[PDB]
Symmetry: D2
Subunit: 284 residues, 4 copies
């Protein structure tokens, strides 16, 4: 009768080597053949306990067989393991505003999945518990883009990859913020400034009137004020002070008509301009 | 604005410790809280890379959050990993014949499952490509016993475990052989032993007639001959020789009537007894 | 000609297994024999690169040989490695006061050294850079006790162990504090209290006089006041307040003579009693 | 009282990270400062056990200190470890003959030393039990070349490195064979070939006389015969047969005078030429 199948009782992967221990018929030949045509053979020690280390072969595939001194073969023991942990990332083309920060205004961002072994057949993406199938593109790259817009907020996202044997590895999570929201800001003459004949006609006797900038979101990275006088527009950086965001022209204006607006941009590259405000300076 | 969520870029488990590296807002507090209510806090270095090691918590469960110098808190990063590789084995109580060779005559053997974490939600046993769900006994031990007898043959078996979070680990396989089959053997007088008048009457004039033992399966581990004389049965060990299995009485037989059968036992502990053979010694 | 010696080009120890890779004559038999009589043999693959894992044998000792298909042996390659990191600790018998804290008043504390493999032949102890030979006692335990008293202070201590092959491992450090110092404390009548006919005769008209406890070191764990009146002594726990350490008897004393002292104990179990103070209460 | 010194109870290096566990005053700040000026701070958990991972710093150098909520600082715990295992190898420039077999005719071979950390203060080469100190060339590469020729034989060699702190690592050994020896070979006319009148005159009547090649060391890898005729030398490859090494001219020789010698080269690249043999063909 041929020897009984060898038994693998321990395995570990340490630095691209598979380390194994098991049992097999004392004195027989243990034959390990990998997916790459490599063969490693050893003599099972007298107590029938063996140990071995082999380089990790393509797709984690190898088979172990016992052969006795007279050429009889055991049942083979096919093994198919997996070692690579998959990675998921926000595509740079779906990463708006500042690049690299995992914040974007793309409500249907594309995710790219990497570090997959060549026998991976199933790739799924978990978005806050909802699981979706990933797609493989023309270049053989796995990716996922939501079919409907994601609402604004912060999403915990990971990828799960399995091979044909059903080995499954789960990525580290990433945290992606969808931010497609920015309040339209507003510019107005500050409290004392709309004076003279009225508190609401936007006609002021101040040649250097002070403006309040309101509805400026906390995640704003840039605040500018646009001033158009006689068909010519100049842009100024807003002041952020103890009083909030304000604008005062850096020199006195001639009497005349000024159209102002304020523009805000946030981290995701959202951009809004205020309704315009038509002011008249009248100091004489 | 609160700080952005911290990022874990690397993890590994080395002797009961989870080792992590990541990024986070420079100078912020990174707070790690595990399922056991432990809290590990660290200050993120100026270059924004952090590293840490924590004891593996119950169920692989912990969350990481960033808090700034003003007490504003980031979105949390929940982790739920699994480290234990499950083990499956043939129950000693289902391992017939030679012990510990994964060969049994039990057609519904019990497999014992071990090394599972408390948050496991799927325990599956793959038998030659078909998965069945494992069961838990009243003591809390996971096992699988097939509901219907297995056919004789070779069975590659593994167990797969998954937690609630979806992490999955696959055992090393075992190879179990079901062997409930054993050919009924045959005892006869060997060539030249059924002598005297007729070659077919089973009357011999030899006082130590040689018998041939036939139809002995290759996995037989024990061969005995049962000799009944004067109503009483004696058991003898057969001898395997250059001509195969035979039996010659160890001392001379008296004239009279004998009844013989051979019994074989295979490595799985199956046993078969031949038809009986009535011989007369007439010397 | 016999095969050339096999070459080991990689080794690592992972969980009681020695993992090895190297080169040797293609198709030859590689024979690994350990210190415990164990033999592990394998066939060198066709490219002449081999890998193996063996249980760590006694004293990290094994030899590797090549044998060709016709029985000729190479030069052997003897290996002798070491895996255990030595440990040093303060002996519990040299650990005064609170046990377990590495603080002691023993200026010649004994250190115990452990986790040494059986082939270790040299054991040295490094105390803030000064290196000393350890000794082995009757039970075969390595230890070190300083020959002269160590001055008070904090010492960074480690152990270095080597085997016969000259492999050397260095322990983690320990930090041991020698504290054999405690100021003798003093008890005195507080500012207003030595009154009546004099500010320095220790005769007071206060029936519940207040005492100051001075020269109490910061590392004191216990402060008590001893009061002897008519040959009978009672002990009280001192008060630590906004004013420091003080004592006031919890009820009025009869007129008469009181002898007081204060006793301090520190973490190392150092213990000092003040000079006694003879006070007289006279309220009539 | 400042807090007591923190304690490191466990360390290990796993892919460029130092992994540590220890104890320290509960709720205190543990500050780790490395040789590169990085600082990693953590809050010690309520149960007083801390764990951490840091990138391996230049020279394995870092210190750990405890600071309490009031800014009092413990005694520091300086660590200085070493992770790199040194490597030694035979310089290709000193590896004669067959390349990469650690066998050479160079009696003062150069060994190249690699994988040393910047704080190394001892670099030693052990040759069959005697240590010599290694040298550093002007480019900064450590090496050892013996000052006096090595005798022929087998040399087990390893390198040992130590830092200023006293940490020591030992390389895997190499086995180098010095072989500068090769027996001078011999060419003669084989049995029956020195024929005709005298068996000793080296006049043959064979136009393709067979020659025996003798005193060929077992480690010979190349055997050639130099045939000089009419003042010009031709080189032939000898043939190793069932009778050993021989040479028969590949085509018939004209009557006249020939001069022969055999040249052997061994695996180490040593070469020897035999004495010349003058033969006359007279057919
Ligand atoms: Ca695979
Ligand atoms: Ca972005
Ligand atoms: Ca926004
Ligand atoms: Ca107005
Ligand atoms: Ca889990
Ligand atoms: Ca069995
Ligand atoms: Ca099937
Ligand atoms: Ca059977
Ligand atoms: Ca008959
Ligand atoms: Ca050793
Ligand atoms: Ca103590
Ligand atoms: Ca003290
Ligand atoms: Ca007085
Ligand atoms: Ca160092
Ligand atoms: Ca060479
Ligand atoms: Ca020597
Ligand atoms: Ca030679
Ligand atoms: Ca002649």
């Amino acid at each position: 009768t041929p020897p009984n199948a060898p038994v693998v009782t321990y395995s570990d992967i340490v630095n691209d080597l598979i380390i194994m221990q098991g049992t097999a018929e004392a004195k027989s030949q243990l034959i390990i053949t990998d997916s790459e045509g490599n063969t490693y053979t050893l003599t099972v020690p007298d107590n029938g306990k063996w140990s071995m280390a082999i380089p990790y072969p393509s797709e984690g595939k190898f088979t172990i067989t016992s052969v006795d001194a007279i050429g009889n073969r055991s049942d083979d023991v096919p093994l198919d393991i997996m070692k690579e942990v998959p990675v998921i990332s926000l595509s740079p083309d779906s990463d708006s505003g500042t690049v690299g920060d995992n914040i974007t205004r793309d409500k249907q961002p594309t995710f790219i999945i990497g570090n997959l072994e060549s026998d991976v057949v199933v790739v799924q993406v978990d978005i806050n518990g909802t699981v979706y199938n990933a797609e493989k593109n023309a270049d053989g790259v796995w990716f996922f883009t939501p079919g409907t817009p994601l609402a604004d907020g912060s999403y915990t996202i990971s990828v799960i990859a399995s091979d044909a044997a059903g080995n499954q590895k789960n990525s580290l999570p990433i945290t992606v913020t969808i931010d497609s929201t920015l309040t339209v800001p507003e510019i107005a003459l500050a409290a004392g400034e709309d004076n003279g004949a009225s508190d609401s006609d936007n006609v002021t006797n101040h040649t250097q009137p002070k403006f309040t900038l309101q509805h400026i979101d906390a995640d704003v990275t840039g605040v500018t004020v646009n001033v158009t006088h006689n068909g010519v527009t100049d842009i100024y950086q807003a002041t952020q002070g103890a009083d909030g965001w304000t604008f005062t022209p850096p020199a006195a204006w001639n009497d005349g008509n000024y159209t102002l607006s304020v523009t805000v941009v946030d981290r995701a590259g959202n951009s809004q301009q205020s309704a315009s405000l038509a002011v008249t300076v009248d100091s004489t």
